[PDB]
Amino acid sequence: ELKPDDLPAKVRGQFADNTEAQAAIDAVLAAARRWCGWHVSPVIVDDVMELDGPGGRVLSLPTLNLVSVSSVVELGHALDVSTLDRSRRKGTLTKPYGRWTARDGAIVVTATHGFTEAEAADWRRAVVQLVGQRAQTRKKIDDVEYEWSVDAELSAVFSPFRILPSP
Amino acid sequence: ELKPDDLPAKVRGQFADNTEAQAAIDAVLAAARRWCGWHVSPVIVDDVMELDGPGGRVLSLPTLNLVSVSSVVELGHALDVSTLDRSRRKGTLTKPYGRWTARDGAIVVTATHGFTEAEAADWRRAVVQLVGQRAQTRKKIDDVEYEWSVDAELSAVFSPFRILPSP
Amino acid sequence: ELKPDDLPAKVRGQFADNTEAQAAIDAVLAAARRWCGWHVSPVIVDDVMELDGPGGRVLSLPTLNLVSVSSVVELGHALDVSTLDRSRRKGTLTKPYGRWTARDGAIVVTATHGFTEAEAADWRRAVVQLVGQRAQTRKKIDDVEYEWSVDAELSAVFSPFRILPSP
Amino acid sequence: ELKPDDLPAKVRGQFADNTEAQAAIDAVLAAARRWCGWHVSPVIVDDVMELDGPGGRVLSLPTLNLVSVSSVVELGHALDVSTLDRSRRKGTLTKPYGRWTARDGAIVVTATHGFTEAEAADWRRAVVQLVGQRAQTRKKIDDVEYEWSVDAELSAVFSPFRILPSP
Amino acid sequence: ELKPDDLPAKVRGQFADNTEAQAAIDAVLAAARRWCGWHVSPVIVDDVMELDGPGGRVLSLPTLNLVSVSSVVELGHALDVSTLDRSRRKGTLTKPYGRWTARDGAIVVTATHGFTEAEAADWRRAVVQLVGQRAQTRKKIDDVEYEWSVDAELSAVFSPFRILPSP
Amino acid sequence: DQAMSKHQAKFFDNGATVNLVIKHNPMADPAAVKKWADEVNSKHAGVDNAWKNLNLYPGADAEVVGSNLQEIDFKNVR
């Protein structure tokens, strides 16, 4: 993950210890993951997610890079994983013929997904730049003059990794 | 690809080591490729692509310069590459008779695509200029005065190498 | 072609050797040729171009000054060159009666085309001026003050040599 | 045409040799002729033109001052020039009975067209002024301050000598 | 005609000899006569003009002050001059009953027309003022500051002597 | 009735029937305008040159204008 060592020296110089830097990092990552709707961090192996019932032919999982899926259980009964159609880019599961359950809390899916640190390089750079901008931070006093939304500030850099709202 | 020695010495001077320069190049390249949707400058050969079925007559590879196709396997059954029409500029394949499948993750395509370092000269220059401008970074203090999105920044120089969103 | 010697002395004085000047020249020519859609450089003798199937009565070759054509092969069979109608200004080939093939990768045409250095003089001047403007390159520091798109920058000078997009 | 001695001495002073002045004149003349679409000041005689068939009653030569026509050959068969009506101002030819062909590159016209150096006095002045202004080249440094398209630049003085695009 | 002696002393003082002043005068008169569509200079006796076929009942000669006409030949046959209706102000010739020829290069008319120097006094003044303005000719350097279309510049003074475009 | 007939007949002697009205860009030489008009008339006149496409140079305007044929109708008074 992102450690205070990976921050630039000048930005870290505005701190006192790695604890507060890690706290700020955690806050920024939490905000980014909440806004984009899914974590872009290193791939989490066998993450367990519970999904409500879509009711259609395709299940829109909350991911944009789905590598593999281990087991799928619906309404207390396990399904055959090999009989489903999965799209890596879309991150959706499609039954061959039929419809998914339309009830809440009926689908539990465990799968491996995410972007690895090798491919996801601009994500860490964007997080680091946002942390530095937050740390560094009309009013005139003598020869010193300064002249002057969370959602807009995030969207200015995190647009490519945001899942569109469900219709 | 691009190495730190390709950067101007003045731009090179702001990084502690060549590893930091390579990291900046990797971040900028990742952002540019994510915006464009495909690599441009390096000729990756025998590239393996997992694409979804469009169901129509033409299949649209995520490339804008298709040199040659090696083998095509659809739904576990390999097709004859010599019977498929190829379009180098559009990067698309057309079945003379019949239609492609419509299920997800049913086509695997192995082909060589991209530009070589010879003709792809403006891409490298744009990447270098973007790296320099990002690494070059109202407020007045004494006689020093300064007055002041990823989408807008990347759209300035990387427009010719974009694949428009699929309809 | 355009050599660093043809650049003005003042512009070349901002370089260190002919290698980087030639690299910048190559980048600028590549960008200009990509934007205009066809090379305006000295006439290339017997250039081999592969064209997709238009499907109509006229074949719109990607050129604006077509001097002569050597051989035309369609769907693996050579045609009679002398039986076609060619327009130098339009750069189009017209069959006497019938239609062209509508399939991809079916037409290969070798022809002599382009603008010679004698007639094409403003092209080199525009390239040189663009290179010089790129090389020469609010912020106030003491008594020094400065106040401030690739497609627009190119179109401002390269409009007369651009092929309109195919409908 | 125009020679470096025709330029004012002050404008002449900024070029290393008369060859550079001739090169600048050639570039400006090429740009002006490309914008207008035909030569203006020199009387080229026995000029050979390869034009496409309009298919209508009147054929439109790319000239605005037709002095006399020498010979007309259509589809390999020469016509009688004395039976074709001529328009010096419009530069057009009308067949009293019948219509011109419609195929491409079927008419070859040999005629003398243009203005002489006597009446064409504003063209030379405009060319000289354009050359001087292009060779005469916010930013403030100490007490020196400066504050600031080919189509707009050429449309300023070269408008009267333009042939409108063919409908 | 207009000689360099008729120019004001101050304007002529910005020249070196009568040759360049006469050249500038010739350029300005050529531009003015081209824009207005007809020469306003001293009356030219027996000027020979060839006119295309109007096809109607009135022939619109390219003049605004027609004093007399000597001979009119149409389609190689001379007409009776005394049987026509001519308007001095309109500068048009009207057949009594019938229509003119509708073919190109069919009418040759020799006539005396123009404005004499006695009546046309503001024309020379306008030409002289335009020449002086051209000769005399943001940028700030120390205490010297300057802050800033041919058709508009001409129309600002030459409107009363312009022939409207033919419908 | 005689005056009505005279007025209805006078339409064919002093009446203009325009089809297209072309508005030209001011930055145009009159001779080029005449040449372009001649070319337009050559390409878009007669029943043979029907249902084609009209390309206009930038800065121009074309409008379709009919007539007033329903003004010579005086049935309610005749």
Coordinates of N, CA and C in Angstrom, one line a residue, chain F residues 16-51:
Chain F
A16 N -42.4 39.9 -61.2 CA -41.2 39.1 -61.1 C -41.4 37.9 -60.3
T17 N -41.0 36.7 -60.8 CA -41.1 35.4 -60.2 C -39.7 34.9 -59.9
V18 N -39.2 35.2 -58.7 CA -37.9 34.8 -58.2 C -38.0 33.4 -57.6
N19 N -37.0 32.6 -57.7 CA -36.9 31.3 -57.2 C -35.9 31.1 -56.0
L20 N -34.7 31.5 -56.2 CA -33.7 31.5 -55.1 C -33.1 32.9 -55.0
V21 N -32.8 33.3 -53.7 CA -32.2 34.6 -53.4 C -30.9 34.2 -52.7
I22 N -29.8 34.6 -53.3 CA -28.5 34.3 -52.9 C -27.9 35.6 -52.2
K23 N -27.5 35.5 -51.0 CA -26.8 36.6 -50.3 C -25.3 36.4 -50.2
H24 N -24.5 37.3 -50.7 CA -23.1 37.1 -50.8 C -22.3 37.7 -49.7
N25 N -21.2 37.1 -49.4 CA -20.3 37.6 -48.4 C -19.6 38.9 -48.9
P26 N -19.5 40.0 -48.1 CA -19.0 41.2 -48.6 C -17.5 41.1 -49.1
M27 N -16.7 40.2 -48.6 CA -15.4 40.0 -49.0 C -15.3 39.1 -50.3
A28 N -15.8 39.7 -51.4 CA -15.9 39.0 -52.7 C -15.7 40.0 -53.8
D29 N -14.9 39.6 -54.8 CA -14.8 40.4 -56.0 C -16.0 40.2 -56.9
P30 N -16.6 41.3 -57.4 CA -17.8 41.2 -58.3 C -17.6 40.2 -59.5
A31 N -16.4 40.2 -60.1 CA -16.2 39.3 -61.2 C -16.3 37.9 -60.8
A32 N -15.7 37.5 -59.6 CA -15.8 36.2 -59.1 C -17.2 35.9 -58.8
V33 N -18.0 36.8 -58.3 CA -19.4 36.6 -58.0 C -20.2 36.3 -59.3
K34 N -19.9 37.0 -60.3 CA -20.6 36.7 -61.6 C -20.2 35.4 -62.1
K35 N -18.9 35.0 -62.0 CA -18.5 33.7 -62.5 C -19.1 32.6 -61.7
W36 N -19.2 32.7 -60.4 CA -19.9 31.7 -59.5 C -21.4 31.6 -59.9
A37 N -22.0 32.8 -60.1 CA -23.4 32.7 -60.5 C -23.6 32.0 -61.8
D38 N -22.7 32.3 -62.8 CA -22.8 31.6 -64.0 C -22.6 30.1 -63.9
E39 N -21.7 29.6 -63.0 CA -21.5 28.2 -62.8 C -22.7 27.6 -62.1
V40 N -23.3 28.3 -61.1 CA -24.5 27.9 -60.4 C -25.7 27.7 -61.4
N41 N -25.9 28.7 -62.3 CA -26.9 28.6 -63.3 C -26.6 27.4 -64.3
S42 N -25.4 27.1 -64.6 CA -25.0 26.0 -65.4 C -25.3 24.7 -64.8
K43 N -25.1 24.6 -63.5 CA -25.2 23.3 -62.8 C -26.7 23.0 -62.3
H44 N -27.5 24.0 -62.1 CA -28.8 23.8 -61.5 C -29.9 24.5 -62.3
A45 N -29.9 24.3 -63.6 CA -31.0 24.8 -64.5 C -31.5 23.7 -65.3
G46 N -32.8 23.7 -65.5 CA -33.4 22.7 -66.4 C -33.8 21.5 -65.6
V47 N -34.8 20.7 -66.2 CA -35.3 19.5 -65.6 C -34.3 18.4 -65.6
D48 N -33.2 18.5 -66.4 CA -32.2 17.5 -66.4 C -31.3 17.6 -65.2
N49 N -31.0 18.9 -64.8 CA -30.2 19.1 -63.6 C -31.1 19.3 -62.4
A50 N -31.9 18.3 -62.0 CA -32.8 18.4 -60.9 C -32.4 17.5 -59.8
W51 N -32.8 17.8 -58.6 CA -32.6 17.0 -57.4 C -31.2 16.8 -57.1

